Amino acid sequence: SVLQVLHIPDERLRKVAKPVEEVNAEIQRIVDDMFETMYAEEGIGLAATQVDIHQRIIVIDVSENRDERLVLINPELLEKSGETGIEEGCLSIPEQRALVPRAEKVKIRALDRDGKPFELEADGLLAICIQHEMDHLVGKLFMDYLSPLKQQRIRQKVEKLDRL
Ligand SMILES: CCCCC[C@H](CC(=O)NO)C(=O)N[C@H](C(=O)N1CCC[C@H]1CO)C(C)C
Numbered sequence: 001s002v003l004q005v006l007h008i009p010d011e012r013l014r015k016v017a018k019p020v021e022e023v024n025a026e027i028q029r030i031v032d033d034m035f036e037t038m039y040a041e042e043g044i045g046l047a048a049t050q051v052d053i054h055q056r057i058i059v060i061d062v063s064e065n066r067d068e069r070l071v072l073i074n075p076e077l078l079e080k081s082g083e084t085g086i087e088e089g090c091l092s093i094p095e096q097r098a099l100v101p102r103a104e105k106v107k108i109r110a111l112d113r114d115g116k117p118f119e120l121e122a123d124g125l126l127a128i129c130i131q132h133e134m135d136h137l138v139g140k141l142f143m144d145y146l147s148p149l150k151q152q153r154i155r156q157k158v159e160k161l162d163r164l
């Protein structure tokens with residue numbers, strides 16, 4: 001099913017997620033709804049928190065053809081290096097984009113859809129995406145990186161939409 005993405009200033013987006021106990025059939029069902037919502041909203045990644053599900057689950061799919069799924073359950077950052085930044089938009093901040101400073105390279109460890117642990121070295125867009133989803137699980141949004149004035153402008157611009 002398609003799940004409802006929370007938008008600022010919904011306080012639930014600021015909720016820190018607890019680890020997934022064991023990857024079971026219910027966890028795997030949450031992974032599907034998440035992917036389904038991700039593809040529906042034309043997003044390249046998604047974290048459970050945006051859907052009001054407070055567990056450490058993240059789905060990412062960067063393929064043009066939508067057939068290269070990446071599941072990150074209980075992800076942990078092992079190492080990071082460099083700086084970079086692209087204009088990022090967030091489904092929770094409806095239709096806004098901004099350049100956000102991010103580490104250029106990251107090495108993580110996580111459990112896949114079957115609960116099997118795996119390590120991953122990411123660079124480029126994958127590295128930035130992982131960082132942005134992981135931020136979600138800890139109640140953090142890309143605009144938190146911005147100045148008070150920009151955060152203010154983002155908040156006021158979002159506040160003109162959501163209706164329509
Ligand atoms: C790379 C930054 C985070 C990617 C994940 C988000 C979706 C999201 O809210 N995840 O929490 C997304 O699809 N963002 C898109 C996005 O920012 N993209 C699409 C690919 C390129 C990059 C824009 O510069 C927009 C268009 C919806």
Ligand SMILES: [Zn+2]
Pocket residue numbers: 089090091092132136
């Ligand atoms: Zn987001």
